[PDB]
Structure formats: C-alpha cells, structure tokens
Design a protein around this nucleic acid. Structure first.
Ligand SMILES: [Zn+2]
Ligand SMILES: [Zn+2]
Ligand SMILES: [Zn+2]
Lengths: 64, 49, 511, 48, 48, 102, 214
DNA sequence: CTCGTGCCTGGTGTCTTGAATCC
DNA sequence: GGATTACACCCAAGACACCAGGCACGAG
RNA sequence: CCUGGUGUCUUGGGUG
C-alpha cells in the first residue's frame, strides 16, 4: 500500500517549511515529492529501504 | 510512630489511644471554619471576640 | 599532548593578512608540596601541619607554553593548578626523611599512606569496577522482543584508555516469527539500524562472494549460510559503494540538506572514526575493519546456532578495576578541556585590543584546583553543575576506627550497579573470584555482594605498551591480514592483541 | 516567548516532574522542590 | 545472605498492600462483616 | 566605544580623536579637537547595535538615515544631544542636525 | 519626512534568529566582519544589515533577500543555536523593531548606586554637557564618630545638622550652606551630582515612609 | 594633582556537547 | 510510555558564578 | 521579674 507522509522539509523553490509531502510507491519503486504550497512535484526512484529523507536528498542534488 | 505501628493499634481496637498519640501528644492545632463555605477563611480576633 | 595546540585565524581585511595565533603546550614540571601563607612566605608542607590547619596537601603544577605568530598577506612556566599528592608516593615529602626524622614530623611509621588530604580530611579513592573494553559479548534477549541475540562492544582507545563509543549488532526474528531473519547493526550517531551487508559494501567490499568469504570460514556449514540468506536479499538493491555510503548519511543525526556530493564525505568520517576506533584511525586501512566486522557476525551466529553458550557477564576475566591512576586521568581530562575553552574565549576578546597578553592573566588556576578538590571531597564524579547523572561515592572518608579497618578500606572495590535491579547475578560470589577477591568479606544490607575486597596476594596491572609485543610476534612468524584466505587457511589460529585482530599464525604450539 | 515562559513557571511551580521536558533547576543545579513533590513519596506530607 | 536481604523487601511490600486493602473492614453489631461503605463482605464473620 | 551623535556610527573613542568621524569630520573636525570636544559630539551611551554592510540598499539603513554613510557599526539610539554651539556651527555649513536620541 | 521611508514589498526580508543570551552584540559584530571580509569576492555574504535590540533579549535580526543567506551569515557562529530556529518578520512589523525609545528639575527620582541607593531624591539641576544631575538628598551621616562606606553598612537618613557637626567634628559657604567632609549641605539636604544613568526616573513608587516625609 | 589600573563588591542571570521487570 | 521496588535508627561530611562599575592607590 | 531560637538538602558509611 502507498505511503502518504508529511515531512518537515523546506521546499527548494517556494521556501515554505513543513509543506513537502512524500508519496512512496514501493510496488513500482517510484517516489513522489509534492509541495502543499506552490504546487511543484518531483519524482525519483526509490528502493525498499528508502524514507522521505532519501528522495528529498535526491531532490537537492537534482537542482544543483 | 510509623505506618506499621498505626496498624497494630487498629488490630488491638485501641481507637482512643491512637487518637491521643497523634494529636495531644504531638502537633494538635485549633482552626476556625465558616459554616457556610467550609473554608478555613475565618479571621478570628480572640481578645476583641 | 592529547590536544597539543590551540589555533586562531582572521583573514585581515580592515591588504589581507592571515594572522594565526597559536599556543603550544610543552613539558610538565612538578614541585614538592608548598604552603603559601597570606604573608607570601613559602615552605615545604608536611602532612601533620596539613591535617591540623585543614589544608590540602597538594603540589603546584607548571606547564611550558609556547607562543607563535604566523602572519601572511594573502612563553615560559605558567602555573595551571595544584594536584593533591597521595601520601608516601614518590612525590610526597615523607618518601625520604628516613625513620629517625619521621618521628620528628609526627608521622607514624605504621601509616602506609595510599590516601589524600583534602581540607584536613583523609580521603581514599575506591576502586571502580567496570566491564572490559574492546571485547565482544553475546547475550540472549527476552521473549516479547523481535531480537533474540545481540552482540555488543564498547570501543575505547589504548592511549589515555578513555571511552569513545558503543556499538551493537542485533539479530532480529523470534522463533518462527519475524519472517526474514536478517541482521542489522547500530552505529554511533545514526538514528536507525542499518543491515550488515550495506555496511560491508560501504567499506569497499561489494560483491556477495567476497562478503561471505570474510564472515563464514566453513563453506559446508549450510545452517549458518541459510541464516545469512535473507540478509543478502534485503540488501541486494544497494549494488555499489556510492549509494551505500549515501544510504548511511541520510540517517546520521545531521542537518537536512547536505547533498550527495558531501553527505557521502560526512558518513566516511562516521565510518573511519567512531566506528571501531580501537583498531585504527588513519586512512587507507579499511581492510582491518572489514575483516573484524566479519568476525563479529561469525560470533553472533555461533551463539544463535547453539554451538556456543552466551557469554557470562560475571566472568572476572572480562572485568577491570579502575584505581587512583585511571580515575584521576579521566577527571583531569575533563577539567583540562574546561581550562582550554576559557583560554580560547579569553583570546578572542584580548586580541581585539591588539595588546600582548601576559599569559599569566589567561590561566585561571581555580579551574583545576577547585575541580579536583570538589570531586575528591564529595565523591561527585563530574563537573559541579552536573552533580546528578555523575557517579557518587568514588571518594570516601578514610575509616580510622581501628588498624584492620584501615587496611580493608584501602583495598576495597565497588561495582556501580545500584540498588535498583534486584535479581542475583552481580551479587553472587562467582567461581572466577577464587584467589582474586575475598569470599568472606562483604557488607550486610543493600551493598551486599556488590562491594568486594581484594584477596591478600592480589595485584593490579599498571599497564604496559603493546608496541613491543607486536614486534615480537612478527619476528617469530606471524603473517599479515592481507595474506589470509579461508580456503588456504582453513585451520590456522587467529591472534588478538588487546582485542584487535592483528594477524594469523599456522603453528601456534611453538609460538 | 514571554507568554510561554509565564506558563512554564506556573507549571513547574506546581509540578516539576512534567514528562518530556527538562526540569526547572536551582542555581545550585539540583531540581526545584515543587508542591507536587512535597506530597508524594516516603518523606512527603502524607506518608511522612 | 543475599536472599534474606533481598526477599525481605519483597514480603514487606506484600504486607503493606494487604493492610491497605483490608484496614477498614469491621464486624458490626448485626454480625455482618462490612467495609466503610457498608458493603457486605460476609453475612456472618468466619461463617461461624 | 562611542557613538557619533551626528551619524550614529560606533567606533573606539580614540578613533574619534585619531581620525575624526569617517562620515562627519568634514564639518565636525573631531580629528583636530580636544577630548572635551570629542565627548560633546560622541556618546559613550547608546543602544541597538546595527551592522550595516550595504548602506545604499539596506532598508534598515534608510530608516536610520545612514544610507549615504559608510559600512560599519551604527547605533539605533544615541543618548545626549549635540551642544547648541556646535548645532549652530553645523547649520552655518548647511548641515541639518536631526537628533538620534529618540 | 520619516513617513516616506516606510518599508515595501521591494525591500529585503528580515529574519529573527535566537542566540545565546548576552551574546547578541557579539553576533552582530561577527556578522559585520564576515560581510566586509567577503565583499567583492566570488562568494559575498548576501546580507544587508544585522542588528540586536536590548529590549529583545536573545535575538538578532538579519536583513537579506534569501533565507540561505541567513544560514550563511550564522555558519560556524558559536553563539547561535544550531536548531533551525529563524523566524520571518512581517513588513508591517519592521519599523517597530527600530523604535529608538524624561527628567525635569524639581521632580523626584530614585538613586540607583551608593549609600543612597533606593533613596528618593529631588532633581536640582543638570550639567551643561548633559550627563550628571545634581540631586537633593536626605543625608546618611555619622559626624565622623568612628573615624581614624557601603550600602549595607550605611547610616539612617536624617537631615544634616550643622550645630551637631560644629560640636562633634565643617566649612560655612553661604546662608544655610555648609561643606562637611567635602560634601555640600544646604538647609539640611545633601546636594550631590549623580550620573543620569545612575538614577531611575520612571515608574517610581513613593513608599509609606516617603509619603510621611515629603 | 590628575589619570590610569587593579581589586573588591554588588547585582543579575546559563549552556561546549555527553536498571530492570512488569501493567 | 511511567510506577514499583521493607522498616526503624545512628553518625560524619558539605554549600553560586561572572561581569561591570566604582573607589582607592600609585605613578608620572 | 516572669518568656526563652540554632538550619536545611543530599551523599556516604553503619546497627537490627
Ligand atoms: Zn514548493
Ligand atoms: Zn464562608
Ligand atoms: Zn558621525
């Protein structure tokens, strides 16, 4: 079953903190970051061990 | 006079003795209460009565 | 020399002129104990005066300090405090004198010393019992837990001898419950348990076949191999070093947002240091940690396979006694850093005035002197503001009721387990106490069985450098760890020196 | 920050064993003896 | 020596809870055995 | 440290004696004064320390009316006022004193 | 006019940051050094200003355009709490952060220092420069009785008595004015200069004893 | 005689990161 | 996640820190 | 010429 989790991460674009939601679909190995404020979305591959800090880390490197 | 000595006097049924030990032979105090609200809020000047 | 230099820096733009301010601590010198009156006059202090006038029998300590001043456009004997002297030791004014003159100093020749004098009161240090460092212990876990066996080790360096960190390897999965029976480890400063295979890959050894060649030295043992099966599959998708190191860094108590380009380089420190620091801390020696990690997993499974009993926590060979020496070093270490930070905080104000500091105004001897006096007088082992959580009762007033009682009191040992925790295991007289602690002498009441007393012929090891022992082992045939293969070495004996696996030898009987 | 601090002092004045947060301390370093701690335990008002 | 020193506090706690459970139980003049609420515990003390 | 009453800059007092005020000395001439003069134009008493790094684009600097001055430490409030004789002399120079004492 | 200098949406943001109590000025200093040292380099510190208000203990305010610059300004600062505790200030709150804020001859003040600490005094006059004020005070004297002072071992208050001084231990200066032990007493009151910073002018509460006397 | 430095007393205010079973 | 963990008694052994301001003494 | 106040909080060591 999918996991819809709220986090305390800051969006890299709109800078609103505590407004990034992480949807981890392990059945298809696809993780999804969403911003509850400005509405952006970032997708990245996840394994079985990953957690909201794993894809949020991949989002920091995808920008820089 | 600890908790276990208290129990022994109950077993003897010596209720009168236990009362005296814990009051007259120790820290007995007189307070005034209000018959309406039941608090110890009474201001009592005894020489002015 | 544990932190031998203080360093400052300012990139002068106010014509940049990096001006590093540096202070180096050198030789230590000791003087005999001296009474300095309010007058200013000084004389040698002997103990009888110290008892009578409620003084502290202590020696002034002087430390060489050296200033240096790097400047790039792009001292002498400072007094640091007084250390209480143990009577009849080599630094006590009674050690000489000779029997005739002892009587003139009002000292009794039957008084054998071994204690301190603090504000006129005689204080003796009580030996503190602790578990050995750098040894693997395996224990079983209670029924309502997903863990069944745990391996534990507290790692502590050889120099100084001081604690560093603690590490655990837990085997999950109950009896027919817990599904995949995998194994995860616990690392210092990481919030979550990490599977074993991942940390093996994170050290530079990644294909399965090499990993199993580091742990199990018996290819036939299919029971052991079947228990490592789920560990491979739960860490299969992590197939190289870089994504392994990053998986670690994403848990290690840091800040949020240090990116992959650096979050690896932060985790490489948590692996190089803090994780098993007793083996080595220099770079390019990760072969020793990988080999040691395999040994741990091997020991863990032997207990889970019921081929070896769990370790007996009360076996006296797994125990150590901290006496006056080691106990003072741990306290002196804490206080010397406190003195250091007060020097550092004072330089940042006194150099903004650009005035040469007279050094003697930047060393407040009250930090060490009051620190040692307070802890020896109360027994509170720590900084005064942190009196709780610190251990109590390490120092006690020396019982002088009778002569026998003085001898017993100076030879007492204490196990600091508590009064909380009933049971029996630390309180029982264990078989391995034979000849080392008295089987008869123990207090009645709450301390019964926890406070013990050294047998008449006991001694305590003072400590010895391990470096000459290594040289002797290699001269007589010990082979390095890079030359070792379980297929070729299916029968040789492993050699440990202070708990670190250092080599292998094929003919142990002659050695 | 100032209103929460008034709430804090009034709380630890009555009960200084609130779970999940650090105890109020005296300058000597030892915890403050709140009213709740006066009544409980072997030496408090009721059992002692 | 350990057993005597340990298990004395085990039984000491046992006796304390027993006394508080039973302290208010009194025989009344009708032969019933009652607590302070007047609940009947036995209709006749010791059944005899 | 003292604060210039005219511009609000915070400097070691001897600086006011050595170099004058870096913002004001064209009119205040503290460099060529005595200590009595320096102490009448600068105050040992001030509050609200402000690091101004970018005078000309800082809103904080514009509010404090230090946006035309040099980067440095400034004070929100400077106690005391310029002596009436110095205020009169500044006014002769086309300089209008707006007190910084609140 | 000050009203034309109000902030707008085009102005930089201001963040507050929690710092160790008593270290607010140090942090402001440290930020300035970092700013000036990095000016013109490839990695300038992109803050405009920083400040600390006494009334707001434990806080520094920092002016910038991006939050990342706030983190940059504070990086490595030992006086700053490592928790990611900065907070945003609203434009409508900016000027109040920079608000800068009595004493009249004949009014009462309370002395804050010396043997007269806590005593009520009348303001008689102030120095030309504007720093110390001459105060009229009920003296606390001993007439040299035990000579061969502190606020804990001082004397009771009582008007100066020149005939007592004449008898026991004095220079006449004018009608009703004597200099006694190098202090001036006029009609029984001490007249002594105090720093204005050494007197309290606000929220004074006269005591029972002061209502009886004055 | 004046200025500067050091010492003592009084008032105000905290923080580098570091024992076990049961319900 | 806390709360529970015998009773009474004896005796010896201890105690805030740092910073700023003011006053006094010494030297120029 | 009757009244008449000397500490606390801990820690440690002991007794049954
Ligand atoms: Zn967003
Ligand atoms: Zn009423
Ligand atoms: Zn100016």
């Amino acid at each position: 079953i999918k996991q819809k989790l709220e986090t305390q991460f800051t969006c890299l674009f709109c800078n609103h903190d505590n407004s990034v939601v992480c949807t981890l679909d392990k059945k298809n190995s696809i993780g999804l970051l969403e911003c509850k404020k400005c509405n952006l979305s970032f997708q990245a591959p996840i394994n079985s061990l990953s957690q909201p800090i794993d894809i949020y880390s991949d989002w920091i490197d995808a920008c820089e | 006079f600890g908790e276990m000595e208290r129990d022994c006097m109950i077993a003897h049924g010596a209720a009168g003795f236990l009362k005296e030990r814990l009051m007259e032979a120790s820290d007995a105090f007189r307070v005034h209460v209000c018959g309406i609200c039941g608090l110890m809020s009474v201001i009592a000047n005894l020489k002015k009565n | 020399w544990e932190e031998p230099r203080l360093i400052l820096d300012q990139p002068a733009q106010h014509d940049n002129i990096n001006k590093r301010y540096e202070i180096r601590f050198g030789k230590i010198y000791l003087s005999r104990p001296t009474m300095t009156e309010a007058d200013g006059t000084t004389h040698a202090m002997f103990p009888q005066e110290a008892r009578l006038r409620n003084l502290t029998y202590s020696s002034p300590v002087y430390l060489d300090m050296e200033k240096s001043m790097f400047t790039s456009i792009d001292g002498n004997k400072v007094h640091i405090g007084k250390v209480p002297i143990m009577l009849r030791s080599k630094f006590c004014s009674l050690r000489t004198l000779d029997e005739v003159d002892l009587y003139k100093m009002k000292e009794c020749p039957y008084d054998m010393g071994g204690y301190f004098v603090i504000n006129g009161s005689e204080k003796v240090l009580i030996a503190q019992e602790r578990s050995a460092a750098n040894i693997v212990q395996v224990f079983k876990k209670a029924a309502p837990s997903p863990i069944s066996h745990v391996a534990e080790i507290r790692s502590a360096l050889e120099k100084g001898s001081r604690l560093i960190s603690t590490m655990q390897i837990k085997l999950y999965g109950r009896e027919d419950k817990g599904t995949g029976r995998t194994i995860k480890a616990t690392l210092p400063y990481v919030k979550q348990d990490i599977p074993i295979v991942i940390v093996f890959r994170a050290l530079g050894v990644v294909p399965d076949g090499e990993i199993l060649q580091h742990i199990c030295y018996d290819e036939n043992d299919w029971q052991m191999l079947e228990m490592l099966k789920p560990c491979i599959e739960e860490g299969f998708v992590i197939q190289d070093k870089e994504v392994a190191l990053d998986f670690i860094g994403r848990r290690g108590s840091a800040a949020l947002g240090i990116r992959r380009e650096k979050r690896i380089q932060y985790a490489k420190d948590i692996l190089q240091k803090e994780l098993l620091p007793h083996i080595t801390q220099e770079e390019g020696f990760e072969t020793r940690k990988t080999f040691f990690l395999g040994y741990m997993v091997n020991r863990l499974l032997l207990c889970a396979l019921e081929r070896k009993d769990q370790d007996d926590r009360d076996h006296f060979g797994k125990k150590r006694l901290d006496l006056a020496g080691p106990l003072l070093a741990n306290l002196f270490r804490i206080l010397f850093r406190k003195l250091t930070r007060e020097i550092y905080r004072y330089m940042q104000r006194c150099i903004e005035t650009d005035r040469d500091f007279n050094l003697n105004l930047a060393v407040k001897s009250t930090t060490i002197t009051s620190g040692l006096k307070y802890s020896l007088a109360t027994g509170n082992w720590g900084e005064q503001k942190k009196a709780m959580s610190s251990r109590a009762g390490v120092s006690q007033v020396l019982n002088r009721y009778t002569y026998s009682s003085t001898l017993s009191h100076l030879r007492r040992t204490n196990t600091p387990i508590g009064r909380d925790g009933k049971l029996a295991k630390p309180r029982q007289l264990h078989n391995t106490h034979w000849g080392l602690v008295c089987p008869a002498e123990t207090p009645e009441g709450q301390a019964c069985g926890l406070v013990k007393n050294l047998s008449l012929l006991s001694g305590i090891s003072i400590g010895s450098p391990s470096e000459p022992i290594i040289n002797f082992l290699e001269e007589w045939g010990m082979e390095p760890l890079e030359d070792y293969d379980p297929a070729q070495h299916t029968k040789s004996t492993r050699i440990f020196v202070n708990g670190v696996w250092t080599g292998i030898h094929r003919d142990p009987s002659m050695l | 920050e100032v209103e929460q601090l008034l709430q804090f002092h009034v709380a630890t004045y009555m009960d200084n064993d609130i779970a999940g947060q650090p105890q109020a301390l005296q300058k000597s370093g030892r915890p403050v003896k709140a009213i709740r701690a006066r009544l409980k335990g072997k030496e408090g008002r009721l059992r002692g | 020596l350990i057993d005597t020193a340990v298990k004395t506090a085990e039984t000491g706690y046992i006796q304390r809870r027993l006394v508080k459970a039973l302290e208010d139980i009194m025989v009344h003049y009708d032969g019933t055995t009652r607590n302070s609420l007047g609940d009947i515990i036995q209709f006749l003390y010791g059944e005899d | 440290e003292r604060a210039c009453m005219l511009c609000g800059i915070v400097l070691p007092g001897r600086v006011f004696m050595q170099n004058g005020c870096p913002n004001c000395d064209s009119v205040l001439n503290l460099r060529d004064s005595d200590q009595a003069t320096v102490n009448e134009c600068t105050s040992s008493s001030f509050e609200g320390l402000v690091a101004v790094g970018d005078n000309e684009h800082s809103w904080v600097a514009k509010w404090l009316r230090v946006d035309r001055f040099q980067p440095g430490l400034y004070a929100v409030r400077v106690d005391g006022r310029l002596p009436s004789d110095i205020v009169a002399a500044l006014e002769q120079y086309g300089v209008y004193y707006r007190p910084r004492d609140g | 006019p000050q009203r034309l200098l109000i902030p707008t949406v085009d102005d930089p943001g201001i963040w507050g940051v929690k710092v160790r109590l008593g270290k607010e000025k140090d942090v402001v200093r440290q930020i300035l050094k970092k700013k000036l040292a990095r000016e013109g380099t490839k990695n300038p510190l992109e803050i405009y200003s920083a400040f600390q208000r006494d009334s707001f203990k434990g806080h520094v305010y920092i002016e910038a355009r991006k939050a990342e610059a706030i983190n940059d300004a504070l990086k490595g600062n030992v006086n700053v709490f490592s928790n990611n505790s900065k907070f945003l200030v609203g434009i409508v709150e900016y000027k109040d952060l920079l608000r800068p804020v009595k004493l009249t001859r004949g009014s009462y003040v309370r002395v804050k220092n010396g043997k007269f600490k806590g005593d009520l005094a009348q303001v008689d006059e102030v120095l030309e420069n504007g720093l110390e004020a001459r105060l009229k005070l009920v003296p606390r004297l001993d007439y040299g009785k035990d000579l061969s002072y502190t606020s804990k071992f001082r004397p009771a208050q009582r008007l100066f008595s020149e005939a007592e001084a004449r008898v026991h231990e004095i220079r006449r200066d004018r009608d009703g004015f004597v200099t006694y032990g190098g202090e001036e007493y006029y009609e029984g009151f001490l007249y002594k200069t105090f720093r204005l910073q050494n007197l309290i002018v606000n929220s004074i509460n006269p005591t029972l004893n002061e209502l009886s006397l004055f």
